[PDB]
Design a protein around this ligand. Structure first.
Ligand code: HEC
Ligand code: HEC
Ligand code: HEC
Ligand code: HEC
Ligand code: HEC
Ligand code: HEC
Ligand code: HEC
Ligand code: HEC
Ligand code: HEC
Ligand code: HEC
Ligand code: HEC
Ligand code: HEC
Ligand code: HEC
Ligand code: HEC
Ligand SMILES: [Ca+2]
Ligand SMILES: [Ca+2]
Ligand SMILES: [Cl-]
Ligand SMILES: [Cl-]
Ligand SMILES: [Cl-]
Ligand SMILES: [Co+2]
Ligand SMILES: [Co+2]
Ligand SMILES: [Co+2]
Ligand SMILES: [Co+2]
Ligand SMILES: [Co+2]
Ligand code: NA
Ligand code: NA
Ligand code: NA
Lengths: 519, 519, 258
């Protein structure tokens, strides 16, 4: 049973926390709810931490006073198909194995499921840790509350005696590295320097042994990722987001200068031994586009290569923790700005980008974004109660489960069936274009070995490799992006038609050169 | 508010209309409901039209007295998947892009949806007008009543200043021509000479600028397509149907001479300046096989080529507005009769037919057709009311939505689940054969470049091109036809097995010749 | 139907012309609701000649207004039918004490759907001594049949007499001609304002109700709320016009402005 501490004693040293805490809606909430600092208080100085206090990072620490939000946060949507592979005629990318080749995603790329599972799913997917981590039982796949309480309560390490990345099962990969975890958990928020730079005060960095880092982490999407625990104010904590918006001055809405003045991030920096260590970004308004955009964006969180000379770019380089902060039509220029590509296609030899869930950068410029709508309006609205305080739901999911709040409050002349039909019209149209982009891209790729074997020149092959970069970018954006065009149907349509145009041009060039060489 | 005209004054000149109007169930319905003829009456002579009277062609003109039928006609089935591409593992023809090659259908071929949308969908599909016409908002896709009231209330032209067919978006085609519109609308019924021949009195013809024609049209599947507006009697208006049944003497049921004597079309011809101009075909009984067969048939409505010498066949030629009026086993002979094929396959170089929704010609000879069943019995029955006049529904759709009326009234020993299971048994079986026909046809097609590049002789390639014609015909009939075999399961089975047999023969010949040439 | 020359009709019917030519029925020919061939052959402006027929079935309107007609004939099965109110399950459990020997004590059921109103008036135990009865207890569901005509679904137990009397032991003969004005207006051209005796009226307040009943067929005729000539909204019920106009009370007697 908790005993409150003398907050004034803490404030004597912790003046920034004092300024945040005394002024906001947690002014009456005592430190003991989230910190055990008895030995710390006995041993600290103005400058030395002394004994490190415990910080309780479980979402359950908030549940004593916010049970409603915590229960919603831990909830599971069983209708979100679990562990469903995308390289599959029943899913998003039937030809993915041809198109992605030997990239790590070829070992497994499933569709997303409920937020409660995010850290568990990161740990156990076949592409991440060589199959090292596994659910303790296949019964455990249902346990959202268990996952929230801690990954290691439901999964286990197949070899606690070693820390190396290796394969435990034949068809797995070891693609995980420490940067990944920033979009799964912030349990390490006090143990990771801004951007993951090596730092005297950081136990973990981009260059850490990822198996050891994994074992130190527990909880998914911590509540304090979107709310400052001291002031309650809305914020973001994700380093690479703050870097793009603030350090690089690109703004919260990089395509809209006025909106970027209306929605702002105010950086706060915390130090260790008088040296800058970590940052947060305080929001002036609770804009969920920025909160959700901590994770639902295209990023680098992985080694790659330089476009200029092909040299490896490893985890020591800041480019391996980067938000591109660009729409699909600006992405190629943004990747050139950092002189970077992800992988060389195993079949075609083309340098290629690897794209991931660019929801926010797709949403920019869309009709709903232009009308001031945000992610949470459609995916995470308030509950509706005849006789209750209407809190915000806290496990985002498709608007199909909540159409009256998500759509019909604005679109008041539609029935639920009509609004869903409008969704399906866009998704069906967009999916059809994705299928055709895959047909043409796979056709181009399958012709590369024919061309090489027929003696087609390097000049022709290099021309088509350059087309492959763009054919790939303007296809993969849309298999990566989870709305199947709904977030921006006109952009999806223009981009996918560009992918097809490029692949058709590449097929034509290869067929002509093969026929000439023959022969 | 309408004021009635003196009909006797009209009849003085319009003696055929008098004979039709005074005798039928519209004898009390005044001309002013459907015509504004004040200046016409002031200026006409026995032979000159003078000022052209207005003819109201909106289905809503009928709604003053037939609201029930009009409301049903405008209704939308949201469960009919909209804008769903067929070249897709989730739809009818997963390998369509290989099989159809560079044909215009490769730019987009969606599944059908509710009748209300037919003219809109024609205008906006990616293969038709280069993307020139577009819904004004993606919200508008739900608006069936809006579409019925006029296409241009819900879609717009991206460049009203020009009339040429061109691409506005990269992956579109300009396959539309004026003949298409005859199966979408009959707003042009007084502006189009029989067969679309150029004619002094016709504003529009097969050779018209299709973008200009499009702008003059508004409403889908006009009510008077199946009902004479003057007499109320059942009729057809589609020129190419009347041409096959009457002018060419093939009969309403070309495979059944006795049934063709029982169900008849009586032509009525109307003149302009003493010259034959347009025709309708009066039905002796309200046989919906003929009414629905105005559109749900295999046709030419497009340029093509001569089988004999390969010469282009353009819109000036009557062959571009033609009903083949033949079952799948007679089709090759029927296309030879007019010396015609649609396209040369881009990969194989084979002349090929292009098939479209041959529902009526598939239905002929089937068990239900032989038992006197018609399309409307399963797709457009009467409403069921405990205490009301039971009118006919007017938006045809799957019998799954109305199983008691569509099936179980006859099949009185089945439950709804049993009747649906019998449908699914046939569709599953037929779909499996379509998949195998695609596998074998795609396999044959993919071997053509290997054979050409290995130096296989033109004699062998020409043998396999002739097999390709039949392999294609006996596959595509079944992806074109929308019942997935239900309308004629034994015919679907024989035809698809023939497609497979032909493709297997072609693969064998190509493999043997490649091996010999090599090794 | 073959249309008549309405201009000819207008030569002797200016009051109807003025209503017909200006409204939304201007194009609707007289033949939909009147058979007047012998009338035209024999009339002068000062002599009716043969009385023309006027069709009063709601089904006369269904040729052009099927949607409204179908809804008009519909039956709400959830409205409990033939449920007596003097009953612990209904509105007035002590009704038999309170009303005593009044005719309503023989039977007073809750209302049900409009389609049945004339039928129900004819067959209730308090109205005609049980003289009129459904032809079968199956017929109670038939809303459309009732709309098409009461006598298609009910029958008279003694067509040979016209007196009000009891046919069943616990019935009453409370009906009189005034009742029918709230059940039907098939009699609209045969009933003078207020039901006064009148040379031109075959029926009146003082008529033999059994004979009057046999001349009536359809419930709540469509033209009770809509003028058939102009389409404009109207009332036809004499007592309501008498309250608003003759008694000088106005349409809303508690609100002068309204
Ligand atoms: C009880 C001892 C609490 C603990 C533990 C947590 N919170 Fe809290 N919170 C508490 C109170 C009394 C209030 C003010 C309520 C009021 O309006 O009177 C709050 C408020 C918040 C808010 C603010 C919402 C708003 O109105 O602006 C947020 C976002 C919030 N609390 C978040 C939060 C988090 C994430 C917690 C775990 C780290 C947490 N709270 C714990 C009381 C208590
Ligand atoms: C990083 C910590 C994240 C934040 C912040 C947000 N999301 Fe998220 N989301 C994230 C992951 C890693 C996943 C997949 C989890 C798994 O185990 O597979 C998701 C998933 C979703 C989904 C799909 C849910 C489903 O039913 O399938 C949605 C609809 C979604 N996310 C939306 C969303 C919103 C609206 C956010 C801001 C309120 C948000 N997410 C933040 C990672 C992270
Ligand atoms: C009693 C006769 C059982 C029946 C019927 C079903 N299950 Fe079962 N299951 C049972 C036991 C005792 C266990 C082991 C539990 C443990 O101590 O670990 C299980 C296990 C499972 C699992 C996990 C399997 C694994 O990890 O190897 C799953 C996914 C599971 N059970 C599901 C399941 C389903 C869906 C059932 C209905 C078809 C079912 N079980 C029946 C006992 C019994
Ligand atoms: C924020 C910019 C992220 C980074 C860094 C990583 N992931 Fe991620 N992940 C993110 C989101 C928003 C989602 C849900 C949306 C989606 O398209 O899946 C996910 C999902 C996953 C999943 C579940 C789905 C799957 O691919 O199987 C896994 C297993 C996963 N993420 C693993 C993973 C790895 C190994 C990472 C570093 C290489 C990584 N994630 C980083 C957001 C972000
Ligand atoms: C970003 C992806 C979030 C995470 C992680 C958590 N919350 Fe949240 N919270 C979020 C939004 C977009 C909102 C609505 C803000 C608005 O003004 O519209 C909220 C709101 C709250 C509140 C306020 C009361 C309410 O509206 O429900 C509280 C007390 C709160 N959130 C608590 C909370 C808890 C306990 C969390 C971990 C279980 C948590 N939030 C995570 C966004 C996000
Ligand atoms: C208010 C905050 C809204 C929410 C919630 C939803 N929609 Fe919306 N939508 C809104 C506006 C103001 C508009 C523009 C209307 C106009 O004047 O043109 C739209 C537009 C759409 C569209 C058309 C998009 C386009 O053509 O670019 C669609 C298909 C649409 N809306 C659907 C839709 C759905 C299904 C929603 C629930 C997920 C939804 N909207 C929510 C306002 C708001
Ligand atoms: C009222 C002024 C009408 C207009 C406008 C339209 N129709 Fe009509 N129709 C009308 C009547 C009074 C009747 C006779 C009804 C009866 O049986 O007494 C009809 C009949 C038809 C039918 C006949 C069905 C049959 O019983 O054989 C058809 C097929 C029909 N009407 C079609 C139709 C069309 C297509 C209209 C718009 C062009 C149209 N009608 C207008 C009255 C009126
Ligand atoms: C030409 C004017 C047509 C006539 C006459 C008939 N049909 Fe039709 N039908 C036509 C088109 C162009 C379409 C596709 C419309 C679109 O926008 O996609 C259709 C569609 C159908 C369907 C599918 C409806 C659905 O829910 O998906 C059916 C079941 C159908 N058509 C049947 C049918 C019947 C039975 C007809 C005679 C009563 C009939 N159609 C006539 C074109 C035309
Ligand atoms: C009558 C013989 C037709 C001719 C001439 C044209 N179409 Fe058609 N169309 C017809 C039917 C019966 C249907 C529904 C059945 C089906 O298989 O689709 C259609 C459907 C369409 C559609 C919607 C479905 C799709 O293919 O995307 C479109 C866009 C369409 N039709 C366009 C179109 C064009 C461009 C035509 C001239 C080249 C044309 N149609 C002619 C019947 C008939
Ligand atoms: C052919 C594809 C049709 C179109 C276009 C329209 N109607 Fe129709 N109608 C059609 C059939 C097959 C039938 C049933 C005929 C039979 O005897 O079984 C009908 C019937 C009517 C009627 C008669 C009353 C009824 O059965 O509902 C009317 C008044 C009628 N149709 C009107 C009408 C209207 C107003 C239309 C445009 C909105 C319309 N029809 C188009 C076939 C077809
Ligand atoms: C066809 C020959 C009709 C007959 C028989 C009846 N009505 Fe009618 N009505 C008819 C038309 C063409 C119209 C105009 C429709 C329009 O869209 O404007 C009407 C209109 C009415 C109205 C509405 C007037 C308004 O203010 O909107 C009413 C109330 C009406 N009709 C009533 C009615 C009655 C009660 C009938 C039987 C006595 C009747 N109509 C017959 C066509 C025809
Ligand atoms: C006299 C011609 C009437 C007119 C005008 C209206 N109503 Fe009526 N109503 C009337 C009777 C005689 C009955 C009982 C019929 C029977 O057979 O029992 C009714 C009944 C109703 C009801 C109850 C319906 C049910 O489901 O039980 C309602 C709700 C009702 N009436 C309402 C109503 C309205 C709103 C009217 C103007 C539009 C109206 N009535 C006119 C007699 C007459
Ligand atoms: C066949 C074996 C029957 C069974 C089972 C049920 N009914 Fe019947 N019923 C049947 C006949 C041949 C008749 C007489 C029809 C005639 O020619 O008049 C009836 C009559 C009724 C009646 C009217 C009774 C009367 O007026 O005396 C009613 C109300 C009725 N039936 C209802 C009914 C119910 C509700 C049934 C299931 C409990 C039922 N019947 C079964 C034939 C048969
Ligand atoms: C209009 C002022 C009416 C007069 C005159 C008569 N009735 Fe009536 N009746 C009227 C209404 C609005 C209703 C429904 C509302 C209700 O409270 O019932 C009725 C209902 C009936 C019924 C069915 C219910 C019942 O009492 O059993 C019957 C059998 C009936 N009315 C008979 C009846 C008789 C015999 C009348 C003259 C003595 C009479 N009604 C006049 C409206 C009016
Ligand atoms: Ca990336
Ligand atoms: Ca064809
Ligand atoms: Cl844990
Ligand atoms: Cl229009
Ligand atoms: Cl009767
Ligand atoms: Co799925
Ligand atoms: Co993904
Ligand atoms: Co589908
Ligand atoms: Co089709
Ligand atoms: Co009751
Ligand atoms: Na559930
Ligand atoms: Na619906
Ligand atoms: Na009912």
């Amino acid at each position: 049973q908790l005993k409150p501490v003398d907050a004034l004693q803490c404030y004597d040293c912790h003046t920034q926390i004092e300024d945040m805490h005394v002024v906001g809606k947690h002014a009456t909430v005592n430190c003991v709810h989230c910190h055990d600092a008895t030995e710390h208080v006995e041993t600290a100085s103005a400058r030395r931490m002394g004994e490190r206090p415990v910080t309780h990072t479980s979402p359950e620490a908030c549940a004593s006073c916010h049970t409603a939000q915590f229960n919603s946060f831990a909830s599971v949507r069983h209708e979100s198909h679990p562990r469903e592979e995308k390289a599959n005629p029943r899913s998003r990318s039937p030809k993915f194995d041809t198109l992605i080749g030997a990239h790590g995603f070829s070992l497994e790329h499933a569709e997303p499921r409920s937020h409660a599972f995010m850290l568990v799913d990161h740990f156990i997917v076949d592409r991440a840790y060589g199959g090292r981590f596994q659910y303790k039982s296949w019964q455990n796949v249902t346990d959202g509350l268990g996952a929230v309480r801690g990954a290691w309560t439901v999964i286990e390490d197949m070899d606690p005696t070693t820390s190396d990345q290796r394969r435990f099962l034949a068809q797995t990969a070891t693609a995980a590295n420490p940067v990944c975890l920033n979009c799964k958990t912030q349990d390490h928020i006090l143990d990771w320097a801004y951007m993951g730079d090596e730092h005297d005060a950081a136990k973990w960095a981009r260059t850490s042994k990822v198996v050891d880092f994994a074992r130190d982490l527990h909880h998914p999407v911590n509540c304090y990722m979107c709310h400052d625990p001291h002031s309650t104010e809305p914020r973001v904590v994700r380093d690479a987001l703050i870097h793009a918006v603030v350090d690089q001055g690109l703004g919260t809405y990089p395509y809209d200068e006025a909106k970027s003045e209306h929605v702002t991030l105010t950086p706060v920096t915390f130090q260790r031994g008088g040296e800058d260590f970590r940052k947060i970004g305080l929001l002036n308004v609770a804009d969920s586009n920025l909160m959700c955009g901590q994770c639902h964006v295209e990023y680098n969180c992985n080694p790659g290569f330089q476009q200029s000379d092909g040299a490896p770019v490893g985890m020591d380089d800041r480019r391996t923790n980067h938000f591109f902060w660009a729409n699909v039509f600006d992405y190629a220029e943004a990747a050139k700005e950092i002189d970077f590509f992800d992988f060389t296609h195993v079949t075609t030899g083309a340098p290629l980008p690897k794209l991931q869930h660019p929801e926010l950068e797709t949403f920019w410029g869309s009709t709903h974004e232009r009308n001031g709508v945000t992610c949470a309006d459609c995916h995470m609205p308030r509950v509706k109660l005849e006789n209750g305080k209407e809190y915000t739901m806290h496990s985002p999911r498709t608007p199909r489960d909540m159409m009256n709040r998500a759509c019909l409050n604005c679109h008041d002349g539609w029935t639920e069936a009509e609004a869903e039909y409008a969704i399906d019209y866009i998704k069906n149209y967009t999916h059809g274009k994705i299928m055709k982009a895959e047909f043409w891209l796979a056709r181009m790729i399958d012709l590369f070995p024919v061309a090489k074997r027929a003696g087609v020149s390097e000049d022709v092959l290099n021309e088509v490799r350059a087309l492959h970069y763009d054919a790939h970018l303007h296809w993969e954006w849309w298999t990566a992006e989870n709305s199947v065009g709904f977030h921006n149907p006109d952009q999806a349509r223009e981009s996918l038609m560009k992918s097809i145009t490029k692949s058709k041009e590449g097929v034509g060039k290869l067929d002509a050169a093969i026929d000439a060489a023959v022969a």
